[PDB]
């Protein structure tokens, strides 16, 4: 609870969540986001609570990811890391489509 970090499979840096710079960490059973230099994740979603994901496509001034939950909930993650924005986006993206169904099993 609070300060908890399970096996991180993907480490993405410089990720903005609603005008907040931080980092996105893909974990074995969940996805979490926390501002830079923070031990506590302000955003924590288990793949079992996510319905599908979306990505702000090429062409936008900023490449981002969107997590759509079962109730129509959405968590936006902006890859503010100029170095590997698109690259880290697709890394999180492909790994999500990979880990999402691992827990996602429902009719919604």
């Amino acid at each position: 609870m609070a300060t908890s970090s399970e096996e991180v499979l993907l480490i993405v840096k410089k990720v903005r969540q609603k005008k907040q710079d931080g980092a996105l960490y893909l974990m074995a059973e969940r996805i979490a986001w926390a501002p830079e230099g923070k031990d506590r994740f302000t955003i924590s979603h288990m793949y079992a609570d996510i319905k599908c994901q979306k990505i702000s496509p090429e062409g936008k001034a900023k490449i981002q990811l969107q997590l759509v939950l079962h109730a129509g909930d959405t968590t936006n993650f902006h890859f503010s890391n100029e170095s590997t924005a698109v690259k880290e986006r697709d890394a999180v993206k492909d790994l999500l489509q990979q880990l999402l169904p691992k827990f996602k099993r429902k009719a919604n």
């Binding site: 599908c52 994901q53 990505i55 702000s56 993650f77 492909d94 489509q97 990979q98 169904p101």
Partner: protein, 45 residues
């Protein structure tokens, strides 16, 4: 340059629209570019 310019931000909010739905893979592996298939049918010499 850069810091000598009027480069400042405090309102660069995240786009909440224009996100292309990302489907699941389940049975997929990133792997690596394999083009060394010894099953072409010419491997007889």
């Amino acid at each position: 340059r850069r810091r000598t310019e009027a480069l400042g931000d405090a309102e660069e909010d995240e786009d909440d629209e224009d996100f292309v739905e990302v489907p699941e893979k389940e049975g997929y592996e990133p792997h690596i570019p394999d083009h060394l298939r010894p099953e072409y049918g010419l491997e007889a010499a």
